[PDB]
Each structure stands twice: as C-alpha cells, then as structure tokens.
Design an enzyme around this catalytic site. Structure first.
Site, PDB file in Angstrom:
ATOM      1  N   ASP A  49      -2.236   5.472  -5.303  1.00 46.93           N
ATOM      2  CA  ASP A  49      -2.511   4.673  -4.120  1.00 46.93           C
ATOM      3  C   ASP A  49      -2.794   3.224  -4.462  1.00 46.93           C
ATOM      4  O   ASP A  49      -3.931   2.849  -4.692  1.00 46.93           O
ATOM      5  CB  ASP A  49      -3.717   5.273  -3.383  1.00 46.93           C
ATOM      6  CG  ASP A  49      -3.934   4.684  -2.005  1.00 46.93           C
ATOM      7  OD1 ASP A  49      -4.776   5.250  -1.280  1.00 46.93           O
ATOM      8  OD2 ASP A  49      -3.276   3.682  -1.620  1.00 46.93           O
ATOM      9  N   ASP A  69       0.815  -1.217   0.000  1.00 48.48           N
ATOM     10  CA  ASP A  69       0.000   0.000   0.000  1.00 48.48           C
ATOM     11  C   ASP A  69       0.841   1.257   0.000  1.00 48.48           C
ATOM     12  O   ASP A  69       1.463   1.589   1.010  1.00 48.48           O
ATOM     13  CB  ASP A  69      -0.906  -0.040   1.234  1.00 48.48           C
ATOM     14  CG  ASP A  69      -1.695   1.217   1.442  1.00 48.48           C
ATOM     15  OD1 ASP A  69      -2.354   1.324   2.496  1.00 48.48           O
ATOM     16  OD2 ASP A  69      -1.648   2.099   0.574  1.00 48.48           O
TER      17      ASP A  69
END
EC number: 3.4.23.15
Lengths: 337, 337, 337, 337, 337, 337
Positions: A223, A35
């Site tokens: 992201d 992430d």
C-alpha cells in the site's frame, strides 16, 4: 508503445509522499498521493463548504474555470482506514508526468478536519484495480494503458528517506517501468492472490531469532498510500510485546535510548526474507531515556473482504523499490538505493 | 464630540489579543478580537448545536434573556483565512469601553472545532469598512461615529509583548484617538490605496543587506486580527530560503540556536523603513540546537479582491503602535513603548 | 523639558542585554549594549575588512549611504575587560527610541573574534562620563541633555530574567526617567564617590550571617555592560569557599540540588542592605542531585584607575531596578519587578 | 440476593478508566467508562456516518448482527461538560461482569472528532439516577437491582495509579458491594443533598494552612466519569493564584521544578478532611524549570440545576476508594490501597 | 564491468557508522562497520559462549542454517586500537547491496564486553589491503574486483551529520564508484605512501594562522572505522592548548558558548588545505555559557608498523566525501554535501 | 490479629521516598520518610522559629489545634549522618494508613537549612528498635504491635524506579505483612547480627569476577532512610577504581555511554548473592559519549557503635523488595517488580 513517464514526489516527515497533477483547461494543479490501496481519483472541490476547514487549507478544483470539464454528478463516498471523504463525480483532462488522460474523478465536498487538516496533500490518485473502484469508475492507470503508449503495463515506486536537504528527491513514481538508478540487485516477484487487489501471500513474520507471527501464512497488502507497516490489533500486540514497546492512542513507542538496539523484523515474501533494522522502523528523534520514540509499525484492522491483512506501506517501500506489474499480476521488490 | 474610550486587551501566547464587550440587557459578556481585517460583529449563539464542541467551550449569546433584543434572522457566513463561521443576524445593545451602541451582529450557530477550539476568544468585532461588510451590515465603528461623541474619527492599537506577570497589560484599543503613553517619536502616515480596506502600498521588503522581495512594490494589509506577518506562498518561500528556515505544515521553523543571529527584516512603508529584529519575529523558546523554534511570519494567500497581499498582524503591531484614521483614510505608525 | 524615551532590550541567556539604535539618514539599525561602564559609542564599519570573521557576522555601518554623515577619521582604541576594538571617528544622527541626536562615534575596523564572535549585539552605546571617554568625545547622554528635551537628567535600566515559556520583554532603558511598571516602592540613592565614574562606596559584603568580605570598605562599579557581579580574584575565592562552590574547569559550580541551601549574599550600599538569594545568583539550569550548576558571580581583576573594584552587573540589576542620576551624581535602586 | 460482580478497568494516562461490556447476541464488545455523572448508556453505531472520523476509530454496534435486538428509535442527545453525542435509543442484552440485563441504550450516530478522537473508550455506561436520565430511560443499575441478585444496593470504584507494568490493574468497579482488598480504615459517609444526583455538601476547601475557598459551604459532584477535580472558573482562579499556577487554554500549569513543593489541598466532607498532596494532583513529568507540568485540577462551570458545583473525579478517587450507596442515598470514602 | 553497489548506513551519535550485509543461503543479516583501517571480515558466532555478555546482545551467525557454508576452523585474532576479538575462519556467500561474493571471514567466539557492549553494530567488513589481513585471507573488496563486475576499482564513503529532527540517511558506501549527490565539485587525490595501507603523507596541521603542528611532515591514516580525527598524545596535547581546551576527566572540553570562537583546523594533504571549522570538530550538544562541550578529536597512540600516525576518521569524512582508489593507490576527497 | 496497613510513597528523583501520616484530632498531615535506620518519630513544630528557613518551607504541627495532644516537653536531639534536629517530646494520635496509634514524638524546633532545605518530606517515622531510640521513647512500630491488630510482626518496603512518562506509585510500605504484587518468587531471610539494629553480616562484595571487597566479612545496615548503597571511604575508593569511575568534583562519575560496560556488583548476604547490574546502580540520566553520569553508590563513614558499616539504601531496595521481620530478628529479600 514505447514511452515512460515519471513524477517527482515530495517526502513529508516520512509519512506522506505526493506528486503533482494538473486538472482542467487551463490546468489547475494539485498535490496528490499515488495510492495502490485505493482505486479512485479525487481532489477537493470549490463546492466544498468552507465550514470544512480542511477545504480552506487545500487547493480546490473549480469546474467553472475549466473549458474541458464534463459534468456527471453522481454521489460517491470514499472510505479509508484513517478517514472518509465524500462528494460527486466529474470528468476532465488530467496530466500526470506528460501523459494527458481524460479521467472521471471525485470532486470532494465533505472533507473532515480530522484527519485532512493533517494532510500536506490535497487529493488522491488511486492506483488500484477497477474491481475495487467505488462507482465502478475506470481508474486512471487503466485509462493510460488504453492509450497504448506505455512500454510495459506496470508502474513503480521509489520512496526516499527524509532529508533536511532541498536537493534530495522525496520519491519517484515511474509510469510504464522502473528506474534502475533507484534499485540494485534483481527484482524478486510474488504473484497476487487475485487480480483486483495489490495483495500477496506472506509466509511468515519474524522478530529477531523467531518466527513468532504469521506462523501459518497471512495476507500482505502493498500500500503506497499507507504511512506505516500495519497488522491486525492482535498481531501487533504480540509484535509490540516482543519489542518491549508501549501502546498509546494512535501509535506505539519505546524509550528513545532503547531504539538502536531493537531487533530486526523480517517479512517472508515469495521465498525471500525482507528485513528491516531498527533504524528502518524507529523514528530515532533522540537517544534520551527521558523521551519517547514512535515506531513506524501500527495496528489497523482492515475489514473484509480485503482484510484481515497486514499492510506494507512507506516504512517497507523506503527499503524496497517496488514494481506493480498489471500485465502479469504481480509485485516485485528490489533493494532501494 | 470630545470623548475617547479604551478597552483593555488580554494577550494570549502572543497570538490572540482580545477585550471584553457586553451584549444585551442585562449584559451578556464576551471575549472578542478587535479586527481590522473584517467588518462584521459576531459572537457564538445559544442556538449553536452542542455537536459543535467549540460552542460547548465558549460564551453563548442567548436572546431569550435579553430585553433589548431585536430579531432579524438573515443568514450570513463569514470567511476568514484560517476558518469560517456561519449563523444569522440579530440586533441588540453593545457596550464597548463605556460607549453604548445599538448594533447588528451575527449569532453564530456553526463554529468548527478546527480552529475555534483553539480560540481563547469567543467572538470578533470587525473594525473594517462597510464596503467589506457581509450582508451590508453597518459596522460598529460607523455606528459609534454617528453618535458624534468621539474626539477624532480614529482608533488605535497597542499590542504588548507577552508577560508571565499578571499586572502587564496585554494590549489596548483606544476609540477616538491614541494613547501617547504607549508610543514615542512621531506618527508617520501612509494613505490607503482606497477607502474600504485597511490596506496600503508597500515599496519593498528587505532581509538583511538586500531588497530581495517586493522589489517593484506590493500590498500590505494592516490586520489587527491576524497573529502573524504573512505574505504570498512564493514571497514567503523566498524569505524563508534566505533565513535558512524549514517549512512545516502550518509554520516555518529554524533550529533554536540559530534564532538570535537571524538577520533583520525591514518593511518599506510611506518613506520609512520599519525594522524587526530576530527577537521580534522568532519565538525564542530555547537556545538548543536539538529543538525547533517557530517564526512569527507565515504564508497566506489572500485571494482577490483584497489580495494578493502581505498582512501585517500582531508580530508587526507589537513593535509599532498603529492608528487607524477614517477621517483622512490613512494608517499611522509610531514606535511602541 | 517634559519627555522621556525608552528602548526595549533583548535578553540573551541572562548574559547579554541589548537593543536598537538607528544611525544615519535614513537609519541603519544596529543592536547595541547600553553600557554604564564605558563612555563611547561605536558600531562595526563597512570599511571593516572581512578577515576579522566577527565583521562578516555583524551589521556594518555604511557612511556612503547617509546624507547626514560627516567625516572625522581620527583613530581610537577601546579597551574592555574582555576584548579590544580599534577604528575611527565618524559623525551622524543617531536615533534612540524617539530621540534624534547628532553624535560622534566609532566606526570599528578591528574586531577580534575573541570575544566578539560571542557578541549577539553589533555595538556599544556608552552611558558613562566624558572623563572616561577615549578621545574626549562628548558621550551620547551628555549630547541628549544638551537638547533640553528630557524631563529629568537621569536614565534607568530594567533587566529581566530569561524565560523559555514566554516572549516577555528582556529589558528596558528609559532615558529621562524611570518606569514604575518595573519596580516597586521607592528609590533609595547612593552618592557617587566622585563624578566621572558610575562607582559607589560599598561598606561590606556578607554571606548569610557574617560581614566576612569588604570590611573596611571597598569600591563598587555599577556596570550595565557586564554580565555578572564581579569581585577581585582573591575576593571571589573567599566568597566561593564560603558557599561550598568549586572550580569545575573554567567556572565555579554547585550541585544543582544544593543551590537552595546557599546563603543570602548581601551588599551593604549607602546604609541599606541589598540582598540576593541563591535563586538570584545561581543559574538553576536544573535542580537535580546528578547535575552541576554555575553561579552568576565571577572573578574580574579590574586595573587602575577604575579598579580594583567590585562590579555590579546584570546579576545585580536583575534584582534591583537601577536609576543613574546625572544631575545629583548618584545611583538609585528599587526592587524587582 | 447474594451475588456481587466486578469489572476490571484499564487506566489510560490517568485520565480515562474503562471496562468492557458485551451488547447483543452474539456479544459485540465495547470499552466503556462507568460514569456517576450521567445516567444513560450509549455506544457508537454502525449507522454513524464515516464522515465522523471518531466513528472510524471506535467499535460500532451493529443491530443487524444481533438476534436479541429490539428497535425503538427515539432520538436523544447527551450533553457532557467536554462534548456532545447524539443518536437514537435501542434495546438489547448487555453483560456487565457476568450480570446479564436487558437495557435501553443509545446508538450514537453523531460523535464529534473533538473530543471523541481523544477517547480510548468507545462508549459510556451512566451510573446516575433515573431523575437525570435523558429520555426518562431506566438506567442500567436500576435494571440490575430489579433482578434481586445484588447483596447490597451499592457499587464501588477503585481507580489505581497509572502503571508502566502490564500486571497492574487500572481499576475496579464492584457491583453490589466493595472490595476490602483495595481500601483500608473505615468508610466515612456523607448523605446526598438529594436522591437523583451523586452530589454532596462540601463544608470547605483549603490550600495549605488556610480555608480560603468554599468558606460558606458549596457543592461536590462525585464524578467517576470526570478526569479531574474541577471547580467554578472563579473558585479555580483563586486556587491557582495561591499555587502560583499559570492558566493555559484547557489547563493550568506550574514550572515542573516547583511541583513537588506545592502545598496540600484539603476537601472538607461530612466531618473528615480529605487531603491530597502535590504528588496526588501534579503530573510530575519532569523536574526541570524549563518545562511545564499540568495539574489534575481544572475549571468547569457546570450549569444549573446540578451546578454551580465542584466535581471530584479521578484525581480524588485514586486517593479515596468510593462506595455509592443507593439504598441509603449516600457516598462513602475510604483510603485506597 | 559496468555496475556499482551501494549500502545505506545508520549513524549512531556521529561516532558509529554501519550497515547491512547478508551471509549464507539464505542470508542472515548483520549490521557491520565498513572499515578501511582493517582488512578482515568478521561477525559474531552461534558458537560464541553466552558468558561474554556482548554475544547475548548481538546477532549471531549460524553455520548449521546455511547451504553454502564450508568449514575452515583456522584460529585468528583481530586487534583493534579499542578492543580485541578472537574466533575461527569460515566460508560463505556474503551479500553486500546487490553483489553476491564468496568470502572467508571470522566467526567471532571471544567478544569482550569492553568495548563491544558499546558496539551498535554486530561485525566488521574490512576494506583495507591483503598486506594487513590477519591469516592472509583475501579481503572482501579484492574478491569483488576479481568478479569483473564493478565499473571502476574504487569505493566511496559518505558519512552524514546526526539529526534528531529528520530520519535522513546516516551515510552511504558505494562499491565501484561515487555518488555525485553527496559531494560537490571534483575530487582531488592524494597518492598513498605505499600500497598496503590507506595512509598518506601529511605536510602540516595548522590551527588558524600558523602551521604549528606536523611541520617536517607526518603520516595520516584515513580510517572509516574510527570515530574521530586522532593524533598522538603529544600532538593532541599541543593542539588542545592552542584551542583553549582542557581535560575534564576523560575528554577534552570547551565552554559551549565559546566553540564558535575556536580557530579553523587545516590538514595540508597533497598540496591542498583540508579545513574543518569549529562547527565541524566540536559537538555543539548545546551553546550555553553554563555547559561544557566535547570535541571530535582525540589522542590515539597507534603502534608500529602502521603508527605512529594521525588517523582521519568520521570527523574528517563528515566534511570531506572520500573515494578510496585501489587501481591507482590513492585517496580522493571532495566537499560536503 | 488479621490486618495489614499500607502507605503509598512518593519518589523524588530516586533519592527521597516519603508518604503521609496524620497527627492529632483532627489529623494534621505531614510527608514523612519511613526510616529503618533510626528509631524516633518527629515532625517540625508550630513553635519552630521562622529564622530557620527550613521551617518556613515545611508543614508545622500545631498542638493547640489537637484535642488529643498531651504535653511532655522533654528535650531531645536527633543526629543523622546528614544533618541534626533538636526539639521536644509531645504525645498524640498518629494515623498511618488506616491504623490509629497513640505515640510520643518530636516537635522539631531547630531545623538547619543544611540539609533540610533539600528535604521534600516534613518529618521522619523511625522504624528502628527501642535500643537506639533517643530518650528511650517507645518507637511507633512497637506501639502498633502492642495493639495486637497486625497479622504478622513485620513491615515491608517497595521502592520504585523514578519515571517521567508515568504517574506510577513511587513506593509502598506495608505494616503487618508484604504485597506479592511488588515482588516475585519467595523471600530468603538473613538473620540480624543482634536484635537492636537492622544490621546483618555481609560475607563479601564482588565486582564482576572476583570477591575483591569485604573478604573476611563486614557489616551491612539495611537503611530505608538512606538514598544510596554506601560503604566506607576506603571501601568505595577501591570500588570506584575497579569500575573506572572518577571524582568529578563532589561525586563519582562515568562516561554515560560506558555505563552498560560496567560489571555486576554482588553483595553476598546469608549464603545468596544479591546482584545489581549497571542499570541498577548508575543514573543513566543520558547515554551519550558526550556526557558524564553519576552512580547511586556513595562513601559514608558511619561512626561507632552502629558503624563502620556498609549501608544498603534505596539503591538496593529498588532492586530487592525488603521485609523487616521483628518477630524473628531477620530481614527478607525478594526481587523486583
């Protein structure tokens, strides 16, 4: 150094991409999302009350079984756009694609049923900068760089389309470089606004034959840990009015028959237009007018200081192989294949 | 003794079977699952915070209204494969099909929304052995035996198929024997590995024309409180590969059109093959290829000491009338009708 | 004797009803249709060559794996109104819902794709009379009567309506009696025209307000092995004209919204009128003015000696629970439920 | 006084109606339900732990940003039929349609995922009487009356049908009177049993051509904050048996094809029969017999002292413009338009 | 050279396959079909009058906005078997999955609603030979071979089955090679009858067990731009008689339940038999006995010189991965996957 | 006067529009169609014998239970283009959205299953002229004008498109005016050919680019009580040939994917062109190439004196909001919405 490692990722309904890591001695394994929108490592803990049903349904790290464990115990709370976890810090050995790194991570003891019961993954491996690290904990990638073994100070993401096939790879993260087998043409790079966040200037967003959004420039967070492409509530209202989409509680929909003929959406980044077609952003589950089809573009108000910003998650990365360059502080994109 | 009692059970979507019990004076009634996979009685408590929404949607035992109540107050936490409840012990009078027994039970004050908001039932009546009783509390069946009134030291389960009819009985538990009106042929018995658990040796599991699973023997928990037939994650992966089923978060599915032609699954128990057809394990909700149909076989890793083990829940018991024999420590099966 | 024995049946799309029998020591379990319109038992064989693609897709009996098999080898051909099978005679223990009976039956080696690729069942259990058994093989029911275990010398059929919103029982055959759970009121019987066929005299078929078919009488076979109510091509032609139905390409249809305007169809049998409403005879797959819907009545020209005759299949049996009374050579009907 | 104010309401899937209010200086805005079944104001708080995911997905009041804030801090817990919230009292300035009133409200710090994650609204503005106010806090309407500006001491509710159009108003609350543009004919009034609750005598409920319910009179709570019309579990069982509806966990359903022909339901109030047709109480989402359609009539056992009672929520108010008269303690109804 | 270049394709209803190309500096992105059955490139123009309603509903190329556009203006008409477009010649950089090539193409100004309102794609990229290019314009592939960048002088097509339960890749074209991920085993090639058309000799088309069509040979065009396998009207008439199919109104159909009884269709090409099963050629939109289902084989009378010929479109390519080998003037096929 | 009165209408499948009226003191509430193509009011009677199965399934008026009923008893027969009712004349207070008017109407005692079993409404409120009223009974609108309460001497109809994803209003009739919420812009009126029928001159019906029907003029009835746009059998035959539509069995159809290729249909009325697109006239029940779709235009041979004429029913009114202007003997149309 001269090595690179890759981790094979699994693709779940095109909304969650995760790979495996090992923690402890002997290794206790975990499905985790890599992430770029966060900077901490955590996994669920054996100390997590079983009144947290999310903990009953995930792999729990148990420190009592690890001969490499090092106690710390500092509390920490990790806040994400779709939920929060809480626990305390511990250190142990973590293996990621054959790299072994000693790593401070969070053992989570509070893991809410909504949304973590909807997680196929157990935990998260934050790939962001120390600047955004909660508890000022050194992130895993910084620790791997220290070892002086990666050929380049970069990592890369391939997110496949979903398959009904077993033998389709869901995705791939390359530590220390890029896999040319999963992109084509050249990388095109944009510099980060600032070191500390995987966030770049975006010069405009267009829907069809009109730059109707981000007309005076705006922010794009890149992201890997977000399912969708998101923008501010008001940015999205406008986009969705133009697509003729209707707002529900958590998503927008169109009538399924209308999906295939919805227009293109372009994202103007560092001098190239990055263009998604309807097939790229509509969950075309049917062609029926008596049915509703979700769009892989959502509303999310990311607050200061990172926000207000657009986020370019999986919906965008499936189209565009992404390289994160720490040495030169930039993101690169190339057509995925 | 010479009596037997039965409790009529309701069948909910083929996944929850429950009957009524009365607790206290005057009786406060509760829908409860009679569960051979656990050994405690509990029901939700008036002391359960209404911030637990599951408590807002169930019948709550209120001790202040019971003139037969006896305080104890010891904390206890009950852990099930799909969730946890927590509370404290109390004693009161409990009626089960005209048997009245003084019984220590749990008043639950922590009852998680997931999954207990999906419970049609309020509580649980564990029918397992004292050996597995949390808090070393005497289970209800042991207490009923003490009274010396049951003709035999056994109980039995009939689980009907679901009906759209009102006048179809969902199921039946007979305390002290079996109802020959709901089985045919003879009972065939297997001895428990050990007294203390309703668990037997299983010699093999076959899918079609091949013993591909449990090839060297394995464990079968006979669990009236589990919806499905379950096995270990890796056992199930194999079974589901062979059926051509796809894994989702909580279940497996096939395309609905494929359901009717899926092969038989057999379970080799004590010298008889126990055989389910597709119609027995597929929720045939449609015949369409553009739809997904759940299988009533799940993955569940039951941990030591009971596990690793298969569990044979409602999916299995609908086919096979089951008698639990405590006097001779064995389970018997017969074709249900 | 004082026993009955029941077999639970799967309903496929309201056109195929079948359940489980076992054959051999130990049992090999096949799906079979219980067919009052024929008198032989047969299953597909291991000796069935893989050419016939219908043998690759159905359970096959393996004599080599049964300690109660006893060779016969005599050839036999079985001709149904839709398809023909050939094979050879074998002997073994067949088990049918709690009863074990020694039986001669067909090992089918020729199994035409047309129509047996459409067959959800493996085989057929003929409930007809010896008079019509190919090879004059004692039919299974006769062999079971000879055991002197059955309470009465009759068997009964319940066929259910298909339902996507419930996993109900698709049907039930009771050997040796009837189940009051699945009818209401009392049976009224019609005597057979002659022992040897499950065929009765019909004294009229009316459409609404006029006995416009089968004045001067006609024959009715009561056929649990047929999907529909059938009549002769001419009979059904006139029936459909009266209903406003038309030949689509293969079948007769009505506009789905107009189904509820169609008249009651009434079969005058043994003094009483047996009435199906439009709900009972039309497949209301939908109710819109924009769709067409098929009927559960089809033309079937049955040849002598058995024909020309009406056949009363699943369609009729769904409405009227049926008892076949071998002692008295008659058939009982009662409603629902 | 001489003013009136209206607040425009949004209609969400016909189950939630909410308008906007501003709290603090500068105003922090919130979507809130105007609720005659409760008497407190609350909104979610910045002090609400983000482990409450419902708090991550709603607007949070932050007192640190309000120069008009006045601390109090008394704990309070608000219990509703479908869930509970908890927090503490604070005072600040609240604007409602151009009326500015100083108001004590609850800052909620415990907001359960079930059901508050299903709330499109953030908070609630109770419009009930002080008698039912938790913490004996003066309700907002009492505070607005004190100002002596409303033409009449009454408020009114218009709840529209749902629209796919943007430019359809979801609803309207008029403070100080009624909008004749959204009703026709005359108001017909019923007196409250007692001041303190928006609850009236109901003389009977009929389903079709029969007063089968509330035969000897019963109670009707007029609840702008309830989605549905509800009655006691046993009252509803009876109603739903008569409609041929089937009970699920949270609702009742019928087969969708059956919806349009379901009978009328009448509610006998103050000498007028208030009549809903099927279209008024069925979520007609399809006409297919292979689908299930929810009814906007639920079971809810409201406990003493307010209950046992029927509740007449949005399902009823869409049909009938409702005026709440505090000066004369009565409710008035008129046909909505 | 040593490069390949791939373009990911969208599948619309198994009848239209298309992907992204870019045209101009900077790129304007259009959906195109990659069509081995024609040899020109064209997109719709900005100069296309809004009368033709098909131009309002498709992306339009704008020469004025491209710094690499170079006027030509020469008129051209393009005649497909279903519809005709006219327009004028332009030049620019076209980008196709990582390759940039200077190309002459059609700006289409006449775009008949019939059939181009049905076109989910904007334009067409002709992968055929110069011999068949209108205006003798060098076709795009020839121009790309001239760059000397491609590893081999071939291109390949994968077309996927459409799926409502997955967002899989709809297809892939690889320029310069093949992707082993989407076939199994090894290619076997058939030589072209002559350079200039992607057309091969066919030595028979059999239906089950008899070469009953195209004895004495016939021609087969391998057409990636056609939805179906086509044959001549007479050919298909006899094909459908053999399958039991009938003309509904517009198309040939079978009862959906009888599809799996239809025989394998086999195309004898270059010594090998290329077999489609009924699953591969019938649209099992459903499987019921109450519905009709269409086939993916249609009559198409192709005129000289190219016809009369069979065409092997999407239907065939879905089963057999196809490599078009320009160096050797042949076509390779391999299975699946 | 200065009032209007509106009745909200239910939409059944875009083919039946009806709403609530009350009859008697106290009101008995029936669903009625508001029908500008007839001039009588009628509901089914309590005196309607239960033979006619259409009377068992519709609300029945009961004179004995109304204190404002006044006997008449005169027989009357009402002939519609689809079905005929007979009955007798009664008098009572009818209530229609806030207006109370004394009215003579039909108590229908003969109610043929064909077509009234298909009727979702109970009765009919004739909005036509006295000139066409059977028995010369003053029609309801005339009686309401005589009260002098209505603001203008007109009434208006909004019919909505049917929607499965919203519980929107199905339609609205406004007595005494119009609702700007449901149209845009301004009305343009066409004068009636003569007082007495809601029938106007039509100066052409064009299909795309050619007035190929009704050159030399024809008549158009504007019929709110008819499901479709109708023309004469010959007229519609030629209309369908022009569209490529074919007679399935009962109705005309197109391949669902080809609907959007069909030309605009334009009705030349009072100088202006009233255009329906294919979306407005075809039931796109689906959009696939594998399904057929019906049109909302049907052949209807209306007899003298009223016919032969086109009828403009629901289909037309859905597109164009309609005002019927009794003062000026004209009809207004405005678009949408």
């Amino acid at each position: 150094g001269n090595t690179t490692s890759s981790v094979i990722l699994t693709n779940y309904m095109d909304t969650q991409y995760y790979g495996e890591i090992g923690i402890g001695t002997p290794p206790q394994t975990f499905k985790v999302v890599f992430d770029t929108g966060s900077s901490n490592v955590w996994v669920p803990s054996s100390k997590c009350s079983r009144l947290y049903t999310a903990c009953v349904y995930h792999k729990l790290f148990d420190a009592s079984d690890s001969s490499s464990y090092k106690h710390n115990g500092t509390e920490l709370t990790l806040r994400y756009s779709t939920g929060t976890v809480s626990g305390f810090l511990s250190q142990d050995i973590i293996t990621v694609g054959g790299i072994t790194v000693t790593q401070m991570f969070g053992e989570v003891t509070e893991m809410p049923a909504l949304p973590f019961m909807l997680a196929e993954f157990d935990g998260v491996v934050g790939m962001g900068f120390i600047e955004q690290a909660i508890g000022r904990v050194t992130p895993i990638f910084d620790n791997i760089i220290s070892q002086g073994v990666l050929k380049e100070d970069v990592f890369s993401f391939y997110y496949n389309r979903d398959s009904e096939n077993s033998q389709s790879l869901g995705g791939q993260i390359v530590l220390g470089g890029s896999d040319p087998q999963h992109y084509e043409g050249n990388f095109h790079y944009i510099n980060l606004i600032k070191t500390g966040v995987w966030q770049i200037q975006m010069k405009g967003v267009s829907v069809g034959s009109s730059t109707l959004l981000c007309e005076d420039g705006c922010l794009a967070l890149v992201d890997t840990g977000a399912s969708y492409i998101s923008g501010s509530t008001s940015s999205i209202e406008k986009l969705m009015e133009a697509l003729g989409a209707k707002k529900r509680l958590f998503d927008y929909v169109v009538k399924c028959n209308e999906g295939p003929t919805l227009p293109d959406i372009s994202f103007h980044l560092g001098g190239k237009e990055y263009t998604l077609t309807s097939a790229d952003y509509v969950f075309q589950e049917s062609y029926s007018s008596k049915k509703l089809c979700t769009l892989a573009i959502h509303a999310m108000d990311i607050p200061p200081p990172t926000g207000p910003t657009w986020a370019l998650g999986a919906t965008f990365i499936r189209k565009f192989y992404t390289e994160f360059d720490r040495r030169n502080n930039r993101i690169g994109f190339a057509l995925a294949r």
